[PDB]
């Protein structure tokens, strides 16, 4: 588990020097943008269950043999299996935006994911068609301004979408 | 070439994709293109007035237009106006491209050869391009006059 | 697109006509959307080459077949490298706004090159069509239209 | 490793639930203090070389026998004094590390983990290092709430020493 | 929530009876039992050998030791099975193993330390890796110690140990607290120069060293693409009957 | 457009005029009598003239 | 039960160590949001009776069959409508409870624990209660940052429903 | 801009480019604002022409001098009619987006014409510059940039 | 030439005495000379560090220092360091003079001829001068870094 605050410590320990002033001016911008980061995080988790089924209205409608007899999302336990861990993508992507660095996500969520997905027999590439459909709905909610003070969180939006692209790359 | 085409070429000869520094360069060009286009429009407005004011500032009532000078014959006066219109027009093209390569490719290629072949005075040409630069920097403003004077001084420095 | 208008008004002895200045101002306005589209196609390159090779080798199996050119791992790696090259030139054409810096590097002599390499050009056109389909799935509607623009130019050029 | 942003994660991960407002609320608190904590980091980094040689000659005052007794552990030899400024200079690094992290994590993982094992084997008495850190917390020249900030982590290393 | 998928168990040593008590060797571990107190040396040995399984000896240290749970064990308020839950669901163990390892390798490392058996196949590691994800790590450690293979073999009041390793390497020794895929992240193979020599001639460096261009860069992409072409048609060319093969209009 | 982008765009104005005389008329220009003649023509209407 | 002050304790208690600055960081952080959270409690307590009957007649709009079908479970006669304002009135209590606690604890322990067990047995569809809570989060009339505050816990009950 | 794009793609053997189709789309999107500018200039025909002509006679009194061309009521009425014609061509160019209506109706052979009429070219150009200044003062600001840049083409092409 | 000498020359070629605009120019130069001298001192402090940081920013770990590149041979690396030290030193002279004429007279005279004769890449030189400009604008401050970047961008624009 690493951070933005702790990773700029950990490489600074490996070189064994004191932290420079332009690294502290970098972290001062991280604190400054912290309030914006928090707001984005709360909107994802409050619409967390609404994203998953709305991704499941297209993850299964686009590749319709998967729930048809024969596919690996066919029976009911099998169907509840790709909702029990469609959300675990959202459970760890929201941990990555909170920490601000994708090192938390890599260790648990994607380290062994591509190995089980050929051991089980599930289509690995049929996951990353719908994790992209999560990202299309996640950045649509995080950007929309409802009852919120006007602000610019564009940088977060692009590197929020970078966490989904890392989440799709190691499965496909 | 462009500034866009120069950025694409510099990214291409390495086999590099478009990294963030190249995107910074292209976004700076896309920021400056507004005043680039407005400056090119108002320079295309009154190019003849700029050339007239420049020869009235620098070349007129000298010995150059007197007999013995290089601008005495009336075909040589017309050739002088043609050369100054060329310098202003190609400086406009280099200002709107944001890259001086078209000056190197189309104007400054074999120009010292020609001007030393014909006996054209080089220092009077440099002072005429300087007067062109002062007149168009007054006419367009300081903020676009800087970029106009950069390419006009490029022509003046390559000529010398 | 600025070099296009500049050599266009440069063949004439006239200046740049202010309608051309209007089109340059409009391209300058749209450059930010162009840069975002190019970065979105930039960071997701290996997905696009993977899905393009997917759809191509599903569509035409003769490159996979040993009589075809892209037989074996080395030849299929060269094939996906060619698709990577064409995606790179498409991003260049997306930034430049007009198809000159992509035709100058990928189109202008491609038929005799692929003829003296043995490869068919129609399979390359189908590969760029697969790249267009994958980028259409990757982007939004107004972004996929503007990407399928230059992808469409490459597909028309290779035929 | 221990960080208030990390402690929100590892609490919510072991429950298997999302980030509630109670984990999210904790993060908000950290920012108010992280603005004053980075004030304390620049105060120690800029005065770093004054503070190390200010400390390693203060410990020689209260313990004059440490420069006199001939031993591998002792700093009486030049080689010990070379390893003097290394060790005390290692402390101000980790104190400045735990300042910008906001937690005691880098202090807990780099410095004090297994410190009772090492000081027993090499016979380095921990009363030496606590005498240097009392010199640092009184002579850093820091003021305001940032003066409180470095004063916790220095004193946290003191209690782990004894 | 969802029940466990059925996984196949491989044949290992401990699925077998191993009859008798007076017959096993010396090398079976000392089966330290809190019911046997008789002294404080047995009390301190029970605490120390319970740290041995959990932290693999080297870590016990001073700081890692939770002094209040050992405070409790002497009193007898909490069983040893409850006491291993205090050591395993402790964040001094979380930073040491749990963050550092993976959900697939954590299943392998906590079965050797809490149940004393290695996982049978990879399918067993695959099976519990889901139970880690939704319930959390302490929810899974709770499910291991509640499990009936634990209570039948160890019981409520016996520290764990490797069951029946007649001819096998010891489990704290064969398995570190982090494996090779994670080794760059917790270890220091990046900064040590001894390993970069090995790395220099490694086949992975030659793929990095090549300039932009060559299809050997796309050779890993070419293996993932698949989609091989069909063979030529079996039917002979001669019959074709080309004169009548053409369709009019 | 190919003739323009091959022999008028990358070269100097007088070099391009002389090379277009090498191609079309098939002989080099004699002196200056032809030279700021065709260059005077180039200054009003362009390459097409 | 889950509270940012409690979550600092149970994290530091399972380690067997004292309260570090990392547990103590959250308390400072919590007060700043707790100042705006108690603003949200008075906004819901004062408008309590308008919000309950505003909600239990909004669910009758989108589900008109619930007042028509004769069932013990349905709200056909007056006894269901008496148990209507009880159940929806129970929700605004626990939402106001989790506001002043700062965490989701009282919401986690009183309301949503075992909610899938009870709604399956009594056949109460959870689509009913989520329709009432969408009416509450849009009609509480709260403004500013306090309007964000009630909006998390309402939406947290929504996700636990589905 | 459609005629120029079509003849430019006609000189080549290929179709219309995606860049050029973006140009046509942006021209359609700005066409309604261009019709608004044409509405204002149509309805301000009188006072714009009179203010520009009187600004010309303030700057250049040589034309209305008795040695000049525009000496007398009829000659000065034809002067104002010439300014009316050029303002009409400017409105055509603002609507079309090309300068080909301005060019092939009033630019292409105007030097030889005004040489044979005895009229100075520079005073025409100064009058169209006065029209540019007047229509710049009437319209909205960057709308006046649009109108004055077509006026700028007419001014630079007359000289 | 100076800014003082340029003002005196511009007043001299007209036969004009020193009018108030020229006195304004000289008094502005006498106001700015303080930070001019301080900037020149701290640039003369650590010129080698600036050149080292600039090649580490722009030119190092590219294909240019790889075999086939123009900086592969060690005499060519030493010539690269020499050229960058020249650009920084003459930009310091032009900053303290307040007039870019010494850049035109001593550096930018026949430099494109030399760099196209030797096959020296021009765009990599422009990016190296850009990295020089960023490093010295960070090192000296923004207020003197503007005037340093003006003459370094003058060298970069004349080179292109
Ligand atoms: C914390 C990170 C983490 C993830 C993501 C994870 C996934 C994971 N998904 C599994 C099964 C499964 N995965 C899926 C999911 C899918 N199959 C489909 O048909 C769909 C295409 C797709 C979802 C979009 C299904 C339906 C099962 C049950 C398959 C079976 O039981 O054979 C299994 C094996 C059995 C299990 O315990 O449930 C694992 C280990 N494990 C992890 O530890
Ligand atoms: C952990 C609990 C918690 C939350 C949720 C929180 C959020 C939060 N977001 C804030 C500001 C803000 N938040 C945003 C966010 C955005 N605006 C947009 O238009 C974008 C689409 C979006 C980012 C993607 C903006 C723009 C501001 C303006 C004020 C600021 O910069 O903080 C502030 C400033 C103080 C206030 O609003 O009273 C708060 C409180 N604070 C807390 O203590
Ligand atoms: C950026 C501009 C650019 C282009 C267009 C380009 C093409 C190009 N394609 C090549 C080979 C190749 N190109 C292909 C092409 C294909 N596989 C198929 O079946 C399809 C027909 C098609 C792609 C899907 C194949 C199979 C080879 C290897 C042929 C051989 O080894 O003879 C080669 C020779 C090997 C090399 O040096 O890479 C070149 C130069 N190079 C360039 O620098
Ligand atoms: C990164 C944090 C960190 C620190 C600070 C650290 C200190 C540390 N200092 C040590 C020895 C030592 N420490 C000292 C320092 C002192 N002895 C004196 O006489 C003086 C009073 C005092 C200095 C002011 C000396 C002289 C030795 C060598 C003693 C020996 O070799 O027996 C040792 C054991 C041997 C070694 O590897 O060198 C450790 C582990 N280790 C760490 O990992
Ligand atoms: C349910 C599936 C399953 C099997 C089969 C199994 C076998 C198994 N056989 C073992 C030993 C052994 N097995 C044999 C067997 C044989 N010697 C012979 O000559 C014969 C050819 C052969 C039997 C027909 C011997 C002699 C040992 C002891 C070897 C030793 O200790 O060195 C052991 C180690 C000690 C123990 O019994 O715990 C295991 C675990 N475990 C399982 O879970
Ligand atoms: C686009 C870049 C470009 C340039 C500049 C160019 C110049 C050029 N200037 C020429 C003559 C001339 N050039 C000048 C110009 C000058 N003499 C002076 O005293 C002044 C200092 C200076 C004017 C500012 C004169 C007076 C002649 C006449 C020589 C003659 O024809 O007898 C000629 C000889 C033939 C001809 O004009 O038609 C060429 C080719 N050609 C080009 O393609
Ligand atoms: C303190 C938090 C808390 C709440 C809110 C709660 C609700 C709750 N409502 C129940 C039944 C009920 N809930 C309702 C309410 C409704 N049905 C309708 O038709 C309407 C749509 C809707 C009201 C708007 C009714 C009518 C019953 C009786 C159903 C039956 O007896 O089968 C039951 C099962 C039986 C019971 O003890 O009365 C529980 C546990 N329990 C709790 O502990
Ligand atoms: C749509 C394009 C178009 C133009 C431009 C145009 C001009 C035009 N100007 C004319 C006369 C004239 N034009 C002027 C013009 C001027 N007085 C000056 O000094 C100024 C420089 C200038 C005012 C701009 C004068 C004074 C006459 C009368 C000359 C005469 O009657 O001989 C005439 C002859 C009489 C007539 O038919 O009106 C034509 C055809 N006709 C056209 O169809
Ligand atoms: C005061 C103004 C001034 C300059 C600049 C100047 C440059 C200059 N650079 C040279 C060579 C060189 N110049 C470079 C420089 C570069 N090549 C690259 O790849 C980089 C882009 C760039 C360095 C930033 C190199 C590599 C050579 C070596 C060519 C050779 O000697 O074989 C030479 C050939 C002889 C020699 O160095 O001793 C000259 C004269 N002379 C001057 O009087």
From Swiss-Prot, chain A:
Pfam families: Phycobilisome. Coiled coil: none annotated. It comes from Nostoc sp. (strain PCC 7120 / SAG 25.82 / UTEX 2576). Contains two covalently linked bilin chromophores. Keywords: Antenna complex, Bile pigment, Chromophore, Electron transport, Membrane, Methylation, Photosynthesis, Phycobilisome, Thylakoid, Transport. It is found in: Cellular thylakoid membrane. The modification N4-methylasparagine is found at residue 72. Belongs to the phycobiliprotein family. One of its GO terms (cellular component) is phycobilisome. Its main location: membrane. One of its GO terms (biological process) is photosynthesis. This is C-phycocyanin beta subunit. (2R,3E)-phycocyanobilin 2 binds at residue 153.
Swiss-Prot record, chains C, H:
Keywords: Antenna complex, Bile pigment, Chromophore, Electron transport, Membrane, Methylation, Photosynthesis, Phycobilisome, Thylakoid, Transport. GO terms for biological process: photosynthesis. It is found in: Cellular thylakoid membrane. Light-harvesting photosynthetic bile pigment-protein from the phycobiliprotein complex. Allophycocyanin has a maximum absorption at approximately 650 to 653 nanometers. This is Allophycocyanin subunit alpha 1. The modification N4-methylasparagine is found at residue 69. Its main location: membrane.
Curated annotation (Swiss-Prot), chains D, G:
Gene3D superfamilies: Phycocyanins. CDD domains: PC-PEC_alpha (cd14770). InterPro entries: Globin-like_sf, Phycobilisome_asu/bsu, Phycobilisome_asu/bsu_sf, Phycocyanin_a. (2R,3E)-phycocyanobilin binds at residue 84. Keywords: Antenna complex, Bile pigment, Chromophore, Electron transport, Membrane, Photosynthesis, Phycobilisome, Thylakoid, Transport. It is a peripheral membrane protein. Heterodimer of an alpha and a beta chain, which further assembles into trimers and the trimers into hexamers. Part of 2 PBS rod complexes, the conventional PBS rod and a photosystem I-specific CpcL-PBS rod. This is C-phycocyanin alpha subunit.
Swiss-Prot record, chain E:
It is a peripheral membrane protein. Residues 10-190 form the PBS-linker domain. It is found in: Cellular thylakoid membrane. Keywords: Antenna complex, Membrane, Photosynthesis, Phycobilisome, Thylakoid. One of its GO terms (biological process) is photosynthesis. Pfam families: PBS_linker_poly (PF00427). One of its GO terms (cellular component) is phycobilisome. InterPro entries: PBS_linker_dom, PBS_linker_sf. It comes from the Bacteria. Its main location: membrane. Rod-core linker protein required for attachment of phycocyanin to allophycocyanin in cores of phycobilisomes. Linker polypeptides determine the state of aggregation and the location of the disk-shaped phycobiliprotein units within the phycobilisome and modulate their spectroscopic properties in order to mediate a directed and optimal energy transfer. PANTHER family: PHYCOBILISOME 32.1 KDA LINKER POLYPEPTIDE, PHYCOCYANIN-ASSOCIATED, ROD 2-RELATED (PTHR34011). Belongs to the phycobilisome linker protein family. This is Phycobilisome rod-core linker polypeptide CpcG4. It comes from Nostoc sp. (strain PCC 7120 / SAG 25.82 / UTEX 2576). The lineage of its organism: Bacteria, Bacillati, Cyanobacteriota, Cyanophyceae, Nostocales. The gene is cpcG4.
């Amino acid at each position: 588990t690493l951070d933005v605050f702790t990773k700029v410590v950990s490489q600074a320990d490996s070189r064994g020097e004191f932290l420079s002033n332009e690294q502290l001016d970098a972290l001062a911008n991280v604190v400054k943008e912290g309030n914006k980061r928090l707001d984005v995080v709360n909107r994802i988790t409050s619409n967390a269950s609404a994203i998953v089924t709305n991704a499941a209205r297209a993850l299964f409608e686009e590749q319709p043999q998967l729930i048809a007899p024969g596919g690996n999302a066919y029976t009911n336990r099998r169907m509840a299996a790709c909702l029990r861990d469609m959300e675990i993508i959202l459970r760890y992507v929201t941990y990555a935006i909170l920490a601000g660095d994708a090192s938390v996500l890599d260790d648990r969520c994607l380290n062994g994911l591509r190995e089980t997905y050929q051991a089980l027999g599930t289509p690995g590439s049929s996951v990353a068609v719908g994790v992209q459909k999560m990202k299309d709905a996640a950045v649509g909610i995080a950007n929309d301004p409802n009852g919120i003070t006007k602000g610019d969180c564009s940088q977060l939006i692009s590197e929020v979408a970078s966490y989904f692209d890392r989440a799709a790359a190691a499965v496909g | 070439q462009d500034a866009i085409t120069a950025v694409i070429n510099s990214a291409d000869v390495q086999g590099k994709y478009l990294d963030t520094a190249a995107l910074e360069k292209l976004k700076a060009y896309f920021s400056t293109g507004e005043l680039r286009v407005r400056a090119a429009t108002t320079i295309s407005a009154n190019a003849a007035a700029i050339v007239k004011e420049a020869v009235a500032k620098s070349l007129l009532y000298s010995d150059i237009t007197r007999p013995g000078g290089n601008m005495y014959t009336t075909r040589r006066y017309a050739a002088c106006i043609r050369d100054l219109d060329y310098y202003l027009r190609y400086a406009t093209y280099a200002m709107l491209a944001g890259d001086p390569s078209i000056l190197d490719e189309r104007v400054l290629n074999g120009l010292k050869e020609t001007y030393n072949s014909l006996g054209v005075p080089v220092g009077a040409t440099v002072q005429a391009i300087q007067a062109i630069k002062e007149v168009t920097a007054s006419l367009v403003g300081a903020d676009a006059g800087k970029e106009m004077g950069i390419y006009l001084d490029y022509i003046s420095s390559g000529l010398s | 697109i600025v070099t296009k208008s500049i050599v266009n008004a440069d063949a004439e002895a006239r200046y740049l006509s202010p309608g051309e200045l209007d089109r340059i101002k409009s391209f300058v306005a749209g450059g930010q959307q162009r840069l975002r589209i190019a970065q979105a196609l930039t960071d997701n390159r290996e997905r696009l080459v993977k899905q393009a090779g997917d759809q191509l080798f599903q569509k035409r199996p003769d490159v996979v077949s040993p009589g075809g050119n892209a037989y074996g791992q080395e030849m299929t790696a060269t094939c996906l490298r060619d698709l990577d090259y064409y995606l790179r030139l498409v991003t260049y054409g997306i930034v430049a706004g007009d198809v000159t810096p992509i035709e100058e590097i990928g189109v202008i002599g491609v038929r005799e090159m692929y003829k003296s390499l043995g490869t068919p050009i129609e399979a390359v056109g189908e590969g760029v069509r697969a790249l267009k389909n994958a980028a259409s799935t990757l982007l939004s509607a107004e972004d996929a239209a503007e990407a399928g623009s230059y992808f469409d130019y490459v597909v028309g050029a290779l035929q | 490793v221990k960080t208030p942003i990390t402690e929100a994660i590892a609490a919510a991960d072991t429950q298997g639930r999302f980030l509630g407002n109670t984990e999210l609320q904790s993060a908000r608190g950290r920012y108010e203090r992280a603005a004053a904590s980075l004030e304390a980091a620049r105060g120690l980094t800029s005065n770093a070389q004054r503070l190390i040689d200010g400390a390693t000659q203060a410990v020689y005052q209260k313990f004059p026998y440490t420069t006199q007794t001939p031993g591998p552990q002792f700093a009486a030899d030049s080689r010990g004094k070379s390893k003097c400024a290394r060790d005390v200079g290692h402390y101000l690094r980790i104190i400045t590390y735990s300042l910008v992290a906001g937690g005691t994590g880098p202090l807990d993982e780099y410095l004090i983990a297994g410190l009772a094992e090492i000081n027993s084997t090499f016979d380095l008495s921990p009363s030496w290092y606590v005498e240097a850190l009392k010199h640092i917390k009184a002579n850093h020249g820091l003021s305001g709430q940032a003066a409180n900030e470095a004063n916790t982590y220095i004193d946290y290393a003191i209690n782990a020493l004894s | 929530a969802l029940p466990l998928l059925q996984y196949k168990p491989s044949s290992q040593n401990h699925r077998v009876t191993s009859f008798g008590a007076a017959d096993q060797n010396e090398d079976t571990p000392y089966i330290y039992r809190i019911e046997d107190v008789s002294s404080y040396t047995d009390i301190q040995n029970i605490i120390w050998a319970s740290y041995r399984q959990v932290f693999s000896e080297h870590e016990i240290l001073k700081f890692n030791r939770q002094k209040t749970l050992e405070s409790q064990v002497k009193n007898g308020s909490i069983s040893v099975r409850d006491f291993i839950r205090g050591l395993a669901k402790s964040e001094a163990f979380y930073r040491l193993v749990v963050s550092v390892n993976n959900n697939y390798r954590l299943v392998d490392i906590t079965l050797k330390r809490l149940l004393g058996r290695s996982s049978y196949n990879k399918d067993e590691q695959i099976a519990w890796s889901i139970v880690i994800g939704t319930k959390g790590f302490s929810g899974f450690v709770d499910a291991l110690i509640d499990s009936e293979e634990y209570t039948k073999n160890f019981g409520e009041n016996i520290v764990p140990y490797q069951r029946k390793r007649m001819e096998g390497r010891p489990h704290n020794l064969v398995t570190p607290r982090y494996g090779e895929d994670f080794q760059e992240k917790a270890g220091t193979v990046q900064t040590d120069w001894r390993f970069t020599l090995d790395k220099f001639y490694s086949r992975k460096s030659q793929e990095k060293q090549l300039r932009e261009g060559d299809p050997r860069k796309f050779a890993d992409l070419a293996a993932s693409v698949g989609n091989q072409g069909n063979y030529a048609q079996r039917i002979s060319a001669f019959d074709i009957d080309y004169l009548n093969a053409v369709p009019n209009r | 457009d190919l003739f323009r982008k091959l022999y008028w765009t990358p070269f100097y104005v007088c070099k391009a005029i002389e090379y277009i005389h090498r191609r079309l008329l098939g002989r080099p220009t004699y002196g200056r009598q032809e030279n700021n003649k065709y260059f005077d023509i180039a200054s009003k209407k362009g390459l097409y003239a």
